[PDB]
């Protein structure tokens, strides 16, 4: 049964807002998992080329045509190499400042990249921590309203108030069940973001060593 | 015997829970066999390592057995390929070859870890979900019990209990399926982490030896 017209106005509003929250959580889930899968697929697909054997300068020359279309690792490489080249050309006397500048550019680019990547994730964790509570508010409102209604009748009949009490239970039936996928997706996607962060950290650990070895040979 | 007369949704809930239990048991057997085999292979290869044999002879021996190669041996074999692929093409810095070999070995370790554990996150997901699926299933049965109560009013003292049992058996099956999954999720994840530590140690030792002796050859 629909059990919406019978339900009070506040209870119906609770069902509506919680349905909307579940819709938003699932949409964010789909979008974020798609984007993370694409980024993970592109990560190694660019790293192999970066380490295939092609010259770093030649690969950078291949770049600069995709100025705004660069993805995570590609954009990181672009920013780092551009900053290093700019420092070396403008100064041409830095003993070891070029690697520091490249590392700073890499770090800021990585931070921006992940902050864009997990753009909506810290909403899932915010609906998983209140969905049980809003559902419990709904069922408590149902129970107390039903008990207040049972304050005039005679014999203190309880079965007559069977629906309303049951309605309160339904408040947590569409309650906690809007939280479980949210929290699990939050945890799993945070794990994926953390593994990507570790991958980019190793990328930096390799790249700074590359510039350290290249600076004295240029 | 009771999986014929419940509601269609409860039928589906019971079906998916039974499938979850069967998949959990099959995954458990498969994983506890393959992990034991991998651990035995890793121990055997570790014993074979540091046997006084030059790494070139070990790589030559591993060359013959290529397709049917797994475990830490692969972490050696593929890695050595990189170490030679940048050596014959003498167009790299002396420190570049070791870094490339380390990257290849790390990629091999990641691939080996991905292949070794496959359905462990599924085990975690079922362990976390099964009670809630059971709760949805039994809540539906309970609401249908109230719907049946609404038809006639005689306090319904006696004829509701079969409905309550048929609704709560969903939760019973749900937690029965949840028991082994959560029991063995940690039991297998700790073993996988131990294997990860072993492989990481092997990679570190390989990188250490490569920097000093094997670079000359």
């Amino acid at each position: 049964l629909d059990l919406f017209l019978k339900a009070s106005l506040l209870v119906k509003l609770i069902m509506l807002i919680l349905i909307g929250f579940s819709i938003a959580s699932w949409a964010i889930i789909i979008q974020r998992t798609r984007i993370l899968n694409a980024a993970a697929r592109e990560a190694e697909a660019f790293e192999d080329k970066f380490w295939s054997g092609i010259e770093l300068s030649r690969l950078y020359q291949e770049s600069q045509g995709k100025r705004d279309n660069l993805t995570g690792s590609e954009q990181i490489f672009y920013s780092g190499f551009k900053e290093f080249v700019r420092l070396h050309r403008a100064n041409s006397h830095a003993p070891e400042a070029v690697v520091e500048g490249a590392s700073r550019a890499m770090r800021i680019s990585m931070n921006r990249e992940l902050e864009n990547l997990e753009t909506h994730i810290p909403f899932l964790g915010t609906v998983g921590s209140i969905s049980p509570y809003i559902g419990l508010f709904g069922t408590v409102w149902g129970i107390m309203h039903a008990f207040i209604a049972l304050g005039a009748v005679k014999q203190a009949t309880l079965q007559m108030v069977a629906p309303g009490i049951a309605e309160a239970l339904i408040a947590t039936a569409i309650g906690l069940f809007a939280a479980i996928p949210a929290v699990m997706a939050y945890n799993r996607l945070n794990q994926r973001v953390n593994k990507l962060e570790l991958n980019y950290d190793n990328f930096m650990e390799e790249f700074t060593a590359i510039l350290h070895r290249q600076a004295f040979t240029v | 015997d009771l999986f014929l007369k419940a509601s269609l949704l409860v039928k589906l809930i019971m079906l998916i829970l039974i499938g979850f239990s069967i998949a959990s048991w099959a995954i458990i057997i498969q994983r506890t066999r393959i992990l034991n085999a991998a651990a035995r292979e890793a121990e055997a290869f570790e014993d074979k390592f540091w046997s006084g044999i030059e790494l070139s002879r070990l790589y030559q021996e591993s060359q013959g057995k290529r397709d049917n190669l797994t475990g830490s041996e692969q972490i050696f074999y593929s890695g050595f390929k990189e170490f030679v692929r940048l050596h014959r093409a003498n167009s790299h810095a002396p420190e570049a070859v070791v870094e490339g070999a380390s990257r290849a070995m790390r990629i091999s370790m990641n691939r080996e870890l991905e292949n070794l554990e496959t359905h462990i996150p599924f085990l975690g997901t079922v362990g976390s979900i099964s009670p809630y699926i059971g709760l949805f299933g039994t809540v539906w049965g309970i609401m249908h019990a109230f719907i049946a109560l609404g038809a006639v009013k005689q306090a319904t003292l006696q004829m509701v209990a079969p409905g309550i049992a048929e609704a709560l058996i969903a939760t019973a099956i749900g937690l029965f399926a949840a028991i082994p999954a959560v029991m063995a999720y940690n039991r297998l994840n700790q073993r996988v982490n131990k294997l990860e530590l072993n492989y990481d140690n092997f990679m570190e030792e390989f990188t250490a030896i490569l920097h000093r002796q094997a670079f000359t050859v």
């Binding site: 049964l1 629909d2 349905i19 579940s22 819709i23 938003a24 699932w26 949409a27 964010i28 789909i30 979008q31 798609r34 | 509601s7 269609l8 949704l9 249908h144």
Partner: peptide, 27 residues
């Protein structure tokens, strides 16, 4: 990519509405 987000929201809504229709269907 707000268009992608709107498309994802629409898809999730399509899943949920048919979900809930099936719930009533089976009731």
């Amino acid at each position: 990519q707000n268009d992608k987000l709107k498309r994802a929201i629409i898809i999730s809504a399509v899943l949920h509405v048919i979900l809930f229709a099936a719930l009533i269907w089976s009731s």
